[PDB]
């Protein structure tokens, strides 16, 4: 079985691999961002949005990955191995769902094709400041 | 942040720890069950149910756990370690979402309190055949 | 003062001594049926039913008895055997009756305790071998 | 599962810790206060106030562990003068709270636990000698 | 800029100087009077009475200078038994005034500070031994 | 008891720890923005806004700390360094947040603290060099 996690939300894995690899903030910055303004919404008993159902499983599954790393740390390249390949897939899943909740789903998707083509023009022919999605 | 994965669906972790530990079928039996009759629904681009959004993330996160186990198998108690503690949490998440999709959400929740009290009566004072939820 | 514990719920102890001593599940499996099915109503800041108020006092009465069991073990064996088995049967049938009045409803349990009475009093030569099962409808 | 026995009645166990441990009358004085006032109502088969359900259970729980004090006495002390002192103190707080909530009303006892809070908190040079008594 | 912390609540700091400096209960007795009564209301994200805003700030200002007493203790006394005695007295007047204005109402505390004025002013031969207590 | 200082105003400390330590002006320039713009409302005998009640307690909490700084200097250096710089950053972001909720309005600040969050978390290679400025409309 092959299923993209972003497929119902209107994006792809390729369109999330369209941004650079080190554009996404770290997991500590992203988890504190969700814990900043989405604690009373994520820990609600009733689900509000399909982003909320996907984000409850993104945090819990990364919790299972971290306690697997501390267990294998006791019994440290393997704790560094998870942040290379398994760590990119959780940052992209966290950044996409946090930003779609704050700003909007279609606003993130239009930003992904805007920052993707901004990073792939020559510097002397593009707007100099990098595009950042923001409120107002 | 502390969030149960079953909290929006009307259950708890305790009510899923109400059944015995080895009641749940293995991950191979459960993944082939979802691949049996939910391939054209889970791999749809549009999300149908909150069980579908939770089940797309249950399969993908267990995929990240298995390739972590083959990587640490190369670089085998650790491949057996994941099936003791990290393996119960994925079987319960797979069994709850497969059975709620087939039969119904409230039918699984009424079955959980039915099989829970069936296993906790003396044998001579209970119905002899174990309760199994089934169609018709 | 000789109070009947569940006289106000439509039963007696004499109606509920008909069940055998091995009819009730153990206190661990009885507290788990209370904790797993409905702890949100037991920890609630209001009293939903008179079974709930009787169930909050019944759990904490057993918890005080379990404090006495570890105290006589650590500080200061037959008395641990006494709380678990002799005074525990009064907690088990108190926990069973209040859980079952909330799961299946109260009138279902009281009609079951009569229909167990016609089964447990007949000699074994003239009764069906399976005991009557408790279930709604 | 840690239940507060008074939480349904509007008082926490922390709010009832305003009263000192040696404030409460003896269990013999509390049971005769019950037997003189509420003997028909406690032994009736009729449903009553939720203090009545908690008062039938608190007397019988004391009665169950009264026979434990009788049984441990002959069959061999330090235990019999522990079971009514330390473990019977939780009966005294439970018997005092339900006798007084039936007689003087519930909300007056909630106003009494606060008004005993301001009495026991004040320094000895500025507190009245009249300890607050509960009267009607 | 010299602000009165009580001026918005109808009392001046001169009017609250009727009460003696050793009248006020200790800060440990005031915080448990808050924690037993108002723990849900203080920690709620909902706007409440203007005593609640001043009570969240008075606890956290005491909490900030509580860590100052911890930090000055090891890192080197006279300072740690000055910061809770002299500088913590302004907390005790601020914690007493807002606990009592929430429980007994605001105008009763304004009527209590005046009625404690006539008690402490009278000569010792003509004053009642009952210091005025605040009850409901 | 673990109280959040501005939970009731629509924020957290975790939402407001995203700003750097050098984002806030010093306590002298923060008290002057309170004293010069509106001291008539801070010295007023009524509470206009819940930011005003939180601002009266925040100024006098710092004034008590400045009394401790001169007392440890005159009577009885690293502890003067501690109040000014380590516990002063908790006063600076408390003074900044309540002043800005009264100047620009509260919803403007909370939408600014999110939009600073998307700026401060991105790496410097992919963010514009100027930080987002706070202003109404």
Residue numbers in the entry:
A (entry chain C), B (entry chain C): 111 to 185, 198 to 258
C (entry chain A), F (entry chain A): 111 to 186, 198 to 258
D (entry chain B), E (entry chain B): 111 to 186, 198 to 257
Paper text:
Here we describe an alternative form, termed N-VelcroVax, a VLP vaccine platform assembled from a monomeric HBc protein (N-anti-SUMO Affimer HBc 190) with the Affimer inserted at the N-terminus. HBc protein monomers comprise either 183 or 185 amino acids and dimerise to produce structural subunits which assemble to form icosahedral VLPs with T = 3 (90 dimers) or T = 4 (120 dimers) morphologies. The dimeric assembly results in the formation of 4 helix bundles (spikes) which project from the particle surface and a sequence at the tips of the spikes comprises the major immunodominant region (MIR). The VLPs effectively bound SUMO-tagged Junín virus glycoprotein, gp1 as assessed by structural and serological analyses.
Reconstructions of each particle stack with icosahedral symmetry imposed revealed that these corresponded to T = 3 and T = 4 configurations, as expected. Interestingly, both reconstructions (resolved to ∼3.5 Å and ∼ 3.3 Å, respectively) showed continuous densities located between the four-helix bundles on the surface of the VLPs. This suggests that the Affimers in the N-VelcroVax system are more rigidly constrained in their position compared to when presented at the MIR region.
